[PDB]
Amino acid sequence: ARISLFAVVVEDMAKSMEFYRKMGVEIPAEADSAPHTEAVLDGGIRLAWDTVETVRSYDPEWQAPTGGHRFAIAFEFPDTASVDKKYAELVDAGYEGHLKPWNAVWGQRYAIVKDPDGNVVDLFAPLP
Amino acid sequence: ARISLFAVVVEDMAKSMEFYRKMGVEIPAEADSAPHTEAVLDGGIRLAWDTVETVRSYDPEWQAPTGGHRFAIAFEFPDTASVDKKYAELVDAGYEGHLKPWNAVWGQRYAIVKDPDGNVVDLFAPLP
Numbered sequence A, B: 001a002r003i004s005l006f007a008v009v010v011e012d013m014a015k016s017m018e019f020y021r022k023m024g025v026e027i028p029a030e031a032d033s034a035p036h037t038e039a040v041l042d043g044g045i046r047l048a049w050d051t052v053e054t055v056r057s058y059d060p061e062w063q064a065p066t067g068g069h070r071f072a073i074a075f076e077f078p079d080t081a082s083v084d085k086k087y088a089e090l091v092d093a094g095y096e097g098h099l100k101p102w103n104a105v106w107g108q109r110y111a112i113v114k115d116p117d118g119n120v121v122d123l124f125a126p127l128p
Ligand SMILES: CC1=C(N)C(=O)c2c(COC(N)=O)c3n(c2C1=O)C[C@H](N)[C@@H]3O
Pocket: A005, A007, A035, A036, A048, A050, A054, B074, B106, B122, B124
């Protein structure tokens, strides 16, 4: 078997797409009306989003979680200043800043925001 | 920016690695002792796991969620019978089967298991 796709459950497709569009993700046209949307990553792994309605049609037991994230999506920037700047742009836009940029022990400038559903999105670049 | 990595928070690295090894993922040697492990996917996107201890060193607010998944990892199989068989192998091994194989409305044989931490893992193949 091969990992082909990572999927995220969204309360509101259009609101989630606004966020991922801003992150730079290539979002299919008209995705705001879709029950399921896919973005294509290098190598052809897919990032997909499904509405809650969609999920409950085959997985009615689904309920949102509460509390911390089990997962994160990490976006790489071409330099460390770009991390700080994008963090600032996202907070401005009203997105939740979770952890302001810092120099991480593992050698990257790092910062953490949340998507509209509260999913963890990491911003990073390698340290000089 | 580019999506570079997807990260999962694990309570027990060795137990999570046993699971992902069984799914076919190429796991670095000695990963059971690591605070952070990465697997490489086509195109060079990384799948990473971090221990809870690791996460709390910079994100002490982290707590596990409760209830449903916000995310899933989807593995593709070369044919639909392989879905049923792998589902069975995983349940045998003691992993939680969440939804037994079915023919999904979107045109795939599909099944859902949970990893040791309760994360959702999809098994699928396209329908003839
Ligand atoms: C409308 C629709 C699709 N057109 C689709 O392709 C798909 C996939 C594809 O999944 C895979 N793995 O390729 C999955 N869902 C869907 C879905 O609802 C809902 C599921 N969450 C599932 O992931």
